[PDB]
UniProtKB/Swiss-Prot annotation:
Ubl conjugation in keyword set: yes
UniProt cross-link Glycyl lysine isopeptide (Lys-Gly) (interchain with G-Cter in SUMO), position: 101
Name of the protein described by the UniProt record: Cellular retinoic acid-binding protein 2
Keyword annotations of the record: Cytoplasm, Endoplasmic reticulum, Isopeptide bond, Nucleus, Retinol-binding, Transport, Ubl conjugation, Vitamin A
Source species taxonomy: Eukaryota, Metazoa, Chordata, Craniata, Vertebrata
Gene name linked to the record: CRABP2
Oligomeric form and interacting partners: Interacts with RXR and RARA. Interacts with importin alpha.
Induction: By retinoic acid.
Post-translational modification: Sumoylated in response to retinoic acid binding, sumoylation is critical for dissociation from ER and subsequent nuclear translocation.
Disulfide linkage: none
Localization: Cytoplasm; Endoplasmic reticulum; Nucleus
GO MF assignments: cyclin binding; fatty acid binding; retinal binding; retinoic acid binding; retinoid binding; retinol binding
Function: Transports retinoic acid to the nucleus. Regulates the access of retinoic acid to the nuclear retinoic acid receptors.
Consequence when changing residue 30 to A: Loss of ligand-induced nuclear import
CDD domains: CRABP2 (cd19461)
Length: 137
């Protein structure tokens, strides 16, 4: 399993609802959902080390981490968390996040590489689940 690639989105489910429970206000939400129409996701994996960049017309976000080692990452709405990724299986990693300040929805994300070359991202905020599917460009 090598998650490396330039990935383009082919389906998305429930992203706007995710942002709502994350408390993003309606104005900022409409801006976000519209932009998320044509993102680019770039991943590079070397062993257990990862870099992930996701870009829309309004914003680019970049993160790097190593599976199994704590790191810091913001929630999708910009709140700081301590995160830790583990392999759930050979083709699926799961990130658990703990907010550093205040209280808020419990957040997580997972990334899975299917045998037919799709990348599936799931993002959770409390009970809301968002799913995005990408293929290589
Ligand atoms: C619309 C989807 C996102 C904003 C997801 C961003 C994202 C990735 C594409 C890779 C995993 C981390 C995370 C920042 C959630």
């Amino acid at each position: 399993p090598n998650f490396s690639g330039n990935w383009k989105i082919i389906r998305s489910e429930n992203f706007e609802e995710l942002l709502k429970v994350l408390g993003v206000n309606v104005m900022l939400r409409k801006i976000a959902v519209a932009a998320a129409s044509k993102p680019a996701v770039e991943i590079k994996q070397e062993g257990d080390t990862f870099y992930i960049k996701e870009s829309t017309t309004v914003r680019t976000t970049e993160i790097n981490f190593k599976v199994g080692e704590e790191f810091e990452e913001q929630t999708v709405d910009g709140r700081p968390c301590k995160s830790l990724v583990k392999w759930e299986s050979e083709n699926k990693m799961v990130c658990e996040q703990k907010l550093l300040k205040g209280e808020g929805p419990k957040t997580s994300w997972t990334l899975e590489l299917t045998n037919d070359g799709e990348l599936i991202l799931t993002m959770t905020a409390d009970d809301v689940v968002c799913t995005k599917v990408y293929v290589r460009e």
